[PDB]
Design a protein around this nucleic acid. Structure first.
Lengths: 49, 1040, 114, 38
RNA sequence: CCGGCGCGCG
């Protein structure tokens, strides 16, 4: 009670590098979908990736 | 529902209207022209003369005096006396058809009833394959008729096809095919594999196949498993036709539709019977699919289901009603013929068949349920439920485990969140906001069509059935994305063939654009729902249905915008039926006059629901106000200004406070008590009935022997409690004498309150005595107390465990103490972040004098859309009102507050705000129970079960295990013998404890063991208990 | 048995011509609207309220410009929403109001100008 | 057999082994997936 | 003071 721990919106801390990592995964998913459309990888390879 | 949210009762409204138009005519047909055995007297109905007349009792009167709201059926009949060759046609009386209210509920015996929808497998052909013991794949095709008749086509180990009908009755295809007359020659030509069928032709089957009748007899032998050779007869075919053809060969309009599709057949629609080609065509796919040709049928797919509304349930009971009438007439025409009389057509038909089968349909059918009237939210959501249970549907034990799961065909039709809790989980569904019932029993949701340049497309909103749902690429994203290319090549998430993709906009066919498309009413009332875990969304929906209407109601500062829809479609507020001007307003009525039509609208004042919740209406307009047709006139209970208002906006802090909010406890302030913030009215009903006994009818009188005048002080001369008297626990309500033992009606425990309504009413009947009924209604004003349950709209529930004075509560930097204190540890484990968003925005709205109605999933516009909305509105309230603590740049949403006991600030900033908190029905004064001793069961002689019966608590086997784990062998014997059923030892314990003189061991058997011995004696088994003395080895027989 | 939800009647150019030619006792209010026009929804609701207010003391009619475009252009309509207040006296001159004018402004025009 | 089926495809269904001009990626995908997964 | 059916709570 004396310290009175609480919980705010900005207390929910995402790590600083999420945006870097989400963009990296988005760039790799964009490249594979183009080459899957090209017929350079098959469906299971795209589904696994 | 193309451009607006449809009425929540529109499915009930349209279904009932369909029954009136086509259900009556389609069922008044098929009524046989009844003829006697001699053919002398012919009775028939003229269905084109059918009529319905408006009910004589008003809808308010039907519920007031426990009647049924129904309309008369007055078809005309023609009776033919060929003896006289004269015709007599009269308007005969068939029965009463119950009428649905504009809200979608019926009234039977003064009880509101709702007919819920049912889900069951759609008729057609279904292909399944199941592994055997050795893993060999076994394919199967199943015919489903219009009445659930399943015709299973199976391939065995020897590739022999058997038309299985039951678990044992097995019939080959050739015998079944030749049973109808398919000659053995043509069966081979119409299939791709004539060899397979010919390989199974034993010389015994060929002779029976060669002739049509021998196949029928052999088919009967295998279907019936009856020893002997049956004789071919017309009755045998009719007996088989009712059992087999009537139940397993009529597909119906829907059944033909699917068979034409799944078996790829160009058969006319009007053919509602299973054509013999379908069976032979099915065998082609069944054997053909074994070789990789095609795909199996998905049984959980919504395209293989149908929905039965009130239209189907009321029409079906009419099928039973008229079939019940013909058996009445047949007995009646035969009875009057034997007397050689000429009976009028009215006397041949009584109203009992129709009236009783509808009276007993609402009473007994599981799909007919009592309307829940706790609050306006419960009135509308009850009618929109979808159940797999009920007649013709799977039971909880019967239910498959692959069912109860979410299927991709449910999206936009069945809410993925709303379901029942317990054994019936996943079996009771709920319709979505925009869902619609199609013309084939299928659920439809609207999607926006994107088409090419050269297309008219007058209306681009088309409702999509689940069968055609898979074959469209439906996107839910937006088009706010551009790069150095063009917009059509930007990628968005989409659905196609029951999977989720990421394709370009130019490949998208349909868009899902409605905000409340995929949710039910319960989940659509949760603001910031996208920040709550879906597990708590199910819990939050249930809790909103348990909210108690408060004596004073107020609108929520933060909402979703669906509160206005709920208020309009619930019927609780008064809605104008005619444009005009307001001329007079008061508590009891509102007078509206328009276009030479002056109406008077009464207002409900302190009425009772089925859940003991008060109903009350207050005017919302003033004299001299112009009104449009369909605009609000007055506000009902839990409704303010035309919106659903189930709770209050209170000042709230999220911090631990000395353990009084441990786990899920809630600490509140006295201001919520003496301010009557959470005060609710509760009305109970007490009924007494007068019966005619052998000694004479029961009498009601004020003069009751062996009673004090203090107990009877509130009675009038007639013997009934006076209107407006404060009764007490044990007080008298209705004084009744049974010849004379006192059989009066007394007030139960905890029922103290004020009597507000008394109804001394006689039910007029054909006897010399009419049953008198008395109904006493007692109001109870319940302020919030310790042990009451409160909850927010985010699955955040809690019990009040402590009430503090305002000077002890923590207070803000403006000096105001908070009203509730919540434990902050309940957020991370429950994962409902949407309550933190709502409290901060509720505080901002109260300072800015603003209300917010926010549609869900606002992050479709931008990232952190809810954060920008809440933070910017918090800063606006801070700046305008000069309250820098409202928005803190260091920690937005949180502020330093002070301890009300010391005046010192708490070390960490606390998230404070003004959320919307509800008061739930689950509360003390309805759960506290105690028992010393009293009444016991007649057979087991154990204490009764139930708080209402003053029963005791059960010590089950798991509780006995715990006592055996402790080794407390004497505590266990107390709860087994002389506190439960040892009749002799229960009376001695009552005596010793009042004198304090030590309790001895029972040493005898309780009445539960002696009860078991007699039952074992009834099976010719003797069970004796012997004691062998360790001193002299004498065997002693215990008395049992 | 069921009252109609809308009191403002839609008329053709010929029907409006006949109405204007014929003897008129109460003021006639002519509305030009199009269903594709966003402001015309609010004007429609305001005119429904006005029709409710003036039960038999005024006549509220509406003309769709997608059906009478040439007639609207002849009547000097430069945009939507546009209202024409036609007095029952043929000697007086009609009043054209352009924009989403307040309901009180309509009441003032009807009371003190028609 | 796989000599008369090919002839029947050619004659009745218009089959012909037209040259597929492939990119290095598609050529590598065809040549490398014939060995195994990884 | 008995059993079924339906709805709920933990």
């Amino acid at each position: 009670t004396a310290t009175s721990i609480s919980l705010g919106i900005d207390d929910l801390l995402t790590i600083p590098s999420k945006g870097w990592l989400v963009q990296d995964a988005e760039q790799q998913s964009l490249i594979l979908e183009k080459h899957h459309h090209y017929g350079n990888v098959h469906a299971v390879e795209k589904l696994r990736q | 529902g193309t451009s607006t949210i449809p009425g929540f009762n529109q499915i009930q409204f349209e279904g009932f209207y369909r029954f009136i138009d086509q259900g009556l005519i389609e069922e008044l047909s098929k009524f046989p022209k009844i003829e006697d055995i001699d053919h002398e007297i012919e009775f028939q109905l003229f269905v084109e003369t059918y009529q319905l007349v408006e009910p004589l009792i008003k809808e308010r009167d039907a519920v007031y005096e426990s009647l049924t709201y129904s309309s008369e059926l007055y078809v005309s009949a023609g009776l033919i006396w060929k003896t006289n060759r004269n015709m007599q046609e009269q308007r005969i009386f068939i029965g009463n058809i119950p009428l649905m209210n504009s809200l979608g509920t019926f009234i039977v015996n003064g009880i509101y009833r709702v007919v819920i929808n049912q889900i069951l497998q759609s008729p057609g052909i279904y292909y399944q394959s199941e592994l055997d013991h050795n893993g060999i794949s076994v394919y199967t095709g199943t015919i489903i008729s219009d009445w659930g008749g399943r015709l299973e086509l199976e391939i065995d180990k020897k590739a022999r096809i058997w038309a299985r009908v039951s678990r044992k009755q097995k019939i080959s295809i050739l015998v079944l095919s030749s049973a109808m007359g398919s000659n053995l020659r043509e069966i081979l030509e119409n299939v791709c594999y004539p060899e397979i069928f010919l390989s199974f032709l034993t010389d015994k089957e060929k002779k029976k196949i060669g002739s049509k009748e021998n196949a029928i007899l052999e088919f009967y032998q295998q279907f019936s498993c009856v020893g002997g050779d049956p004789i071919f007869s017309e009755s045998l075919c009719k007996e088989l036709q009712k059992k087999f053809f009537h139940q397993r060969c009529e597909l119906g309009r829907i059944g033909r539709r699917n068979i034409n599709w799944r078996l790829n057949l160009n058969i006319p629609q009007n053919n509602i019977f299973l054509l013999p080609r379908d069976i032979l065509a099915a065998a082609d796919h069944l054997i053909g699919m074994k070789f990789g040709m095609g795909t199996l049928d998905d049984m959980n797919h919504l395209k293989n289901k149908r929905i039965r509304s009130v239209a189907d349930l009321l029409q079906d009971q009419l099928g039973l009603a008229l079939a019940r009438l013909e058996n009445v007439v047949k007995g009646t025409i035969g009875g009057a013929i034997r007397h050689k009389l000429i009976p009028t057509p009215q006397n041949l038909v009584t109203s009992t068949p129709l009236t009783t089968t509808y009276e007993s349909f609402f009473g007994l059918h599981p799909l007919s349920q009592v309307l829940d009237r706790t609050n306006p939210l419960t009135q509308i959501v009850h009618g929109r439920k979808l159940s797999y249970l009920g007649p013709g549907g799977l039971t909880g034990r019967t239910a498959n485990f692959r069912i109860r799961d979410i299927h991709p065909s449910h999206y936009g039709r069945i809410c993925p969140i709303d379901t029942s809790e317990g054994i019936n989980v996943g079996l009771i569904g709920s319709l979505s906001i925009h869902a619609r019932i199609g013309d084939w029993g299928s659920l439809e949701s609207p999607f926006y069509e994107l088409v090419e340049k050269s297309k008219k497309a007058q209306i681009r909103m088309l409702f999509l059935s689940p069968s055609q749902d898979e074959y469209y690429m439906i996107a839910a994203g937006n088009s706010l994305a551009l790069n150095r290319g063009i917009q059509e090549e930007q990628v968005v998430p989409a659905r196609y063939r029951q999977e989720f993709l990421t394709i370009a906009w130019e490949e998208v066919h349909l868009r899902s654009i409605f905000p409340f498309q995929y949710f039910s009413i319960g989940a659509s009332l949760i603001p910031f729902i996208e920040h709550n875990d879906a597990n708590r969304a199910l819990m939050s929906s249930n809790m909103q249905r348990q909210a108690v209407p408060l004596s004073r109601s107020e609108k929520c500062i933060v909402g979703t915008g669906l509160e206005r829809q709920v208020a309009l479609d619930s019927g609780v507020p008064a809605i104008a039926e005619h444009e005009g001007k307001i001329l007079y307003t008061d508590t009891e009525k509102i007078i509206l006059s328009g276009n030479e039509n002056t109406l008077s609208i009464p207002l409900i004042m302190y009425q009772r629901s089925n859940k003991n919740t008060c109903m009350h209406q207050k005017p919302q307009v003033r004299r001299g106000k112009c009104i449009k047709k369909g605009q609000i006139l007055a506000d009902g209970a839990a409704t303010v200004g035309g919106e659903l208002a189930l709770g209050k906006n209170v000042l709230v802090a999220y911090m631990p406070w000395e353990g009084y909010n441990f786990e899920d406890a809630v600490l509140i302030s006295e201001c919520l008590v003496y301010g009557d913030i959470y005060t609710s009215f509760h009305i109970r009903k007490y009924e007494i009935q007068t019966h005619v006994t052998t000694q004479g009818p029961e009498r009601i009188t004020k003069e009751i022997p062996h009673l004090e005048g203090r107990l009877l002080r509130n009675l009038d001369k007639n013997g009934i409690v006076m209107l407006g008297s404060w009764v007490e626990t044990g007080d008298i309500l209705v004084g009744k004498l049974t010849p004379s033992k006192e059989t009066c009606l007394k007030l139960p425990i905890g029922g103290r309150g004020r009597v507000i309504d008394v109804r001394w009413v006689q039910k007029k009947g054909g006897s010399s005595y009419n049953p008198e009924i008395i109904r006493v209604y007692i109001s109870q004003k319940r302020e919030i107390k310790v042990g009451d349950k409160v909850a927010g709209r985010h699955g955040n529930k809690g019990i009040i465990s402590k009430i503090l004075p305002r000077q002890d509560m923590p207070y803000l930097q403006d000096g105001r103490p908070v009203d509730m204190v919540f434990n902050p540890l309940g957020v991370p484990s429950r994962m409902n972040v949407g309550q933190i968003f709502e409290c901060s925005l509720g505080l901002a709205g109260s300072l800015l004098d603003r209300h917010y109605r926010i549609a869900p999933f606002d992050e479709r516009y931008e990232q952190e859309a809810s954060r920008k909305l809440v933070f910017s509105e918090l800063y606006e309230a801070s700046k305008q009102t000069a309250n820098p603590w409202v928005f803190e740049p260091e920690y937005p949403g949180k502020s330093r507050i002070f301890d009300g006991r010391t005046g010192d600030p708490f070390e960490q900033p606390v998230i404070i705000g003004k959320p919307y908190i509800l008061k739930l029905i689950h509360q003390v004064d309805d759960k506290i129970h105690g028992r010393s001793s009293g009444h016991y069961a007649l057979v087991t002689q154990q204490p009764l079960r139930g708080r209402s019966k003053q029963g005791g608590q059960r010590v089950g086997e798991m509780e006995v295990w715990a006592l055996e784990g402790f080794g407390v062998a004497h505590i266990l014997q107390e709860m087994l013998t002389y506190k439960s059923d040892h009749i002799r030892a229960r009376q001695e314990v009552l005596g010793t404890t009042i004198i304090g003189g030590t309790i001895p061991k029972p040493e005898d058997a309780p009445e539960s063991f002696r009860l078991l011995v007699r039952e074992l004696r009834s099976l010719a088994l003797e069970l004796n208990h012997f004691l062998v003395s360790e001193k002299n080895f004498q065997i002693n027989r215990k008395e049992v | 048995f069921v009252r109609e939800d809308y009191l403002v009647r839609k008329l053709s150019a010929q029907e409006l011509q006949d109405l204007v030619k014929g003897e008129r006792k109460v003021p006639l209010i002519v509305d030009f609207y199009a269903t594709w026009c966003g402001p015309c929804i609010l004007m429609a609701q305001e005119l429904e309220m006005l029709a409710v207010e003036y039960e038999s003391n005024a006549m509220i009619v509406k003309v769709d410009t997608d059906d009478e475009y040439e007639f609207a252009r002849d009547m000097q309509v430069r945009g939507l929403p546009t209202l024409f207040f036609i007095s029952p006296d043929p000697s007086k001159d009609a009043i054209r109001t352009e924009g989403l004018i307040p309901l009180q402004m309509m009441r003032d025009i009807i009371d003190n100008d028609m | 057999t796989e000599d008369e089926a090919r002839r029947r495809n050619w004659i009745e269904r218009g089959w012909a082994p037209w040259e597929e001009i492939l990119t290095p990626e598609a050529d590598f995908a065809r040549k490398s997936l014939n060995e195994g997964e990884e």
